[PDB]
Design a protein around this ligand. Sequence first.
Ligand SMILES: O=C(O)C1(Nc2ccccc2)CC1
Lengths: 234, 179
Amino acid sequence: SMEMDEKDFAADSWSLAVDSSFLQQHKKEVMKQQDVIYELIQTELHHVRTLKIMTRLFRTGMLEELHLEPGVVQGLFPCVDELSDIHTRFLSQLLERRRQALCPGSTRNFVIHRLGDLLISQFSGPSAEQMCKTYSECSRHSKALKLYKELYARDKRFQQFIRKVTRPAVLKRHGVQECILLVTQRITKYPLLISRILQHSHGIEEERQDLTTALGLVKELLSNVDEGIYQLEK
Amino acid sequence: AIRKKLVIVGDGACGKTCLLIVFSKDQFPEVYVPTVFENYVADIEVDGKQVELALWDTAGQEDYDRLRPLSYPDTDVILMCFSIDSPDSLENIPEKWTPEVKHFCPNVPIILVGNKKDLRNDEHTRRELAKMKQEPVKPEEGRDMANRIGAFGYMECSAKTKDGVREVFEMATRAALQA
Ligand SMILES: O=C(O)C1(Nc2ccccc2)CC1
């Protein structure tokens, strides 16, 4: 993560992130809509930060510091590169939409009026096909956990590496298995966030319809991922 | 410090996400109540023992029967939640949630938790429930259900007023510690 984005999303809510004299200019319903939109980007930043810990710290650290057998590291972190590309691009678009919305002379005061279009783009077409295919490939979640458990309890260098990279307090809730479940659970958070954003987006009818469509798209994706899962065993 | 894993299960309106947030923040969010809970590692000390309790939610997974069980591996304690203002969520405990939790988490202790206990004496709640020939879940009904499903124990709490929240998580730590 980059300091720029961590600061822009350090506050517990949009009403606390913006200047109080800017908050005072908006209707209550706008503040409620903006708080849920801020939570969507904030939790998307954390999810992308999780996938970066998996690729850069866990996976790459094991390739450069350990002599693990070929295919072992891949089995521990399946599709992490594909997942990191899918979500870093989606995060980039959410952050760009926020930036275009900033007031001149300000780096924190903004209002996102049009989010549904961005969500329809993400959960439709080729990008939706790639998320469905990458998340269906969850089928390797249990095997990754068993592989991790086997190595920790039988390998001295693997245990020393794990104890070393997970020692900082910033990785308290971000260990190997915590990372894997955080990624599996991410897709099922989207309907929750989108329905609460929609709950406060009846002001402009095109926005309510865009969000209604975007919600239907996420649920179709989740139903497809759920039907394509079958646990693999080693 | 020993690492233990807690998972909270139950219907969508049971209030499991609010319970996790109020516990992890140790405060009722005064400006914004978040929609989702990611995870949390709580530093708890119960009966002299220091434990790291990883907290997980299953909210958003209730409709996805192949995605949902991926939350279960290595679980040490199950929080089976139901809302006191919703007798129908309690009725779903033995026929939907209990068979699943005992298949994927055999011999794992289950604490049956009655959430939203402040609503038991709410004017709007009692009136709204009466329009469907129903009334808030009584304490004896929750205790009966926990016996019927072989729960480790039965507890009640109110995430809104923070009453009973600390005790549920200290008990859950104690259940995770038993072997
Ligand atoms: O042994 C302890 O320190 C704990 N308490 C405990 C309480 C009652 C019965 C058994 C055990 C688990 C926390």
